[PDB]
Amino acid sequence: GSSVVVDTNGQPVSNGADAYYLVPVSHGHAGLALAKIGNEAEPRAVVLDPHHRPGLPVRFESPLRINIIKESYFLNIKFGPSSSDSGVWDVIQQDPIGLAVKVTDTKSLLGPFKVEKEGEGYKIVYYPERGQTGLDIGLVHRNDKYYLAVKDGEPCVFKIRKATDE
């Protein structure tokens, strides 16, 4: 594709080097955080938490040796610094959420996400097996939390803010 992903200042989003907040377009009062899911003792699920704004910043990574991100590129999304792979996103079946966004400490060369234009911002789309069919990431309300999870046709729409406040 031609379409370059841009931040809230209109600047191309960097390939891994800079961090960004995923700021929901109608939930700017809330931000990404980790929470417990199922019977797990460690918080490994990604939620939109009304107590954290702007929330945990992310980096977008492609193996391509380019310094910008296109909507067409398969991406890894991760929390933490460039040097760490302990915050890498994946999508995992977990009742009763469904296909939940969770953090891994392992990473494929080519991740399973794309960042696609939607409305006034972007949505995150998950491509099982890096195929042709994408599933929108939205919100699933369970146990008083708003989990990021597959909700095809009901995406959570984000703008992308460079994390220069840190």
């Binding site: 594709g1 031609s2 370059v4 191309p12 390939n15 891994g16 080097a17 990574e61 492609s62 193996p63 391509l64 040796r65 380019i66 310094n67 910008i68 296109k70 590129y73 398969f74 460039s82 040097s83 060369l109 080519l110 890096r130």
Partner: protein, 223 residues
């Protein structure tokens, strides 16, 4: 370029800078007076291309040209399989007059030779995570197909080859995409993809295997 040095000025006169709002995002390679080869992942609907550069400031580079291009042709099997067939041809709006600082390079007909030392050039990130002010050059050595496939399967395809991974930590890096890998006087590859951080020992970068595409390139340029 990781663990390289400033190029001898204008020693790579085929080098093209692809710029977006006055900032470099990819390189390419002049292969005909009206055509620039680059990586297909660098596709845009239009281009601003810097030729004859060393620094990226054309107003400080005698002999340089900043030229427009609208038309580009991605290889028809780009990204099937994923990351494969990573080349495109950009047709300049007008043919450039070649000089000692703006000159086309011939493409290798023969496949890469395992072990051979080659040169890669670009304006991408340095080991310190900063962008250079002038074009950088480094040597990397071609790795066998057996080693490339072991490291990169299931994404290794023969439209690719690997180079680097030495103890010397010499590599290409982000912003080097589309730029040249020169072997034994000929254009052998384009910078395509690899791992980050760049320059890991035992981890070569991946280059477009241009010997597989000499017929498609010649037919596209002649059509």
């Amino acid at each position: 370029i990781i663990n390289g040095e400033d190029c001898s000025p204008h020693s790579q006169p085929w080098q093209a800078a692809l710029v977006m709002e006055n900032e470099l995002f990819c390189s390419g390679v002049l292969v005909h007076p009206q055509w620039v080869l680059s990586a297909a992942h660098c596709f845009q609907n239009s281009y601003t291309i810097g030729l004859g550069l060393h620094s990226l400031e054309a107003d400080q580079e005698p002999g340089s040209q900043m030229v427009e291009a609208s038309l580009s042709v991605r290889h028809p099997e780009y990204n099937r399989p994923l990351l494969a067939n990573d080349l495109m041809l950009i047709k300049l709006d007008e043919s450039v007059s070649e000089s000692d600082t703006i000159r086309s390079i011939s493409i290798a007909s023969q496949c890469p030779t395992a072990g051979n030392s080659c040169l890669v050039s670009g304006w991408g990130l340095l080991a310190n995570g900063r962008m250079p002010t002038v074009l950088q050059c480094v040597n990397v050595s071609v790795v066998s197909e057996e080693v490339c496939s072991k490291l990169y399967d299931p994404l290794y395809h023969p439209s690719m080859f690997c180079a680097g991974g030495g103890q010397d930590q010499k590599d290409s890096c982000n912003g080097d995409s589309g730029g040249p890998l020169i072997c034994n006087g000929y254009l052998q590859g384009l910078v395509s993809f690899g791992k980050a951080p760049c320059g890991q020992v035992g981890v070569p970068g991946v280059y477009t295997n241009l010997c597989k595409f000499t017929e498609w390139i010649e037919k596209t340029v002649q059509a």
